[PDB]
Amino acid sequence: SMSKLTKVTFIGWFKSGEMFTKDIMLSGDREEIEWVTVQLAEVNNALVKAFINDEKVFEADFRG
Amino acid sequence: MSKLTKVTFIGWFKSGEMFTKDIMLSGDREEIEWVTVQLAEVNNALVKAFINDEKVFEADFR
Structure with missing residues (x-):
């Protein structure tokens, strides 16, 4: 909710195998x-x- | 190879900055x-x- 936000951890893999990560x-x-x-x-x-x-x-998965 | 696995690590520095490693x-x-x-x-x-x-x-070692 707005008063109780959900913390979502995203983990990403590029086609290269390089990675990224974010908390949103x-x-x-x-x-x-x-x-x-x-x-x-x-x-x-x-x-x-x-x-x-x-x-x-x-x-x-949008790496193709 | 059967004895090995890929492990995904996610880390948070105390600043809140993140890192992520495939090992x-x-x-x-x-x-x-x-x-x-x-x-x-x-x-x-x-x-x-x-x-x-x-x-x-x-x-946790922050």
Whole structure:
């Protein structure tokens, strides 16, 4: 929620095998998390996994 | 090769800046635990170790 933000840890792999990672605070729920994941992956031509409380909740692979 | 696994480490410096490392290790958990602790202690960081996207160890030296 807005009053209790969800902390999502994103882990990304570029096609090169190089990695990136970010913590993002989100006020929404499933749809937002998925959209943000897809956008992160697509913009970066990457595989991106979303984690909440150390558990994988979604992933999107745009490495091709 | 059957004795090896790729392990994904995520780390947080005390500043909150993050790092993430993909490291091939022995599949035996004692080794993965040792590397988790070493990475955390050397970098004065919180480090989490993931295998097959499951968190298996965590060490905090912030």
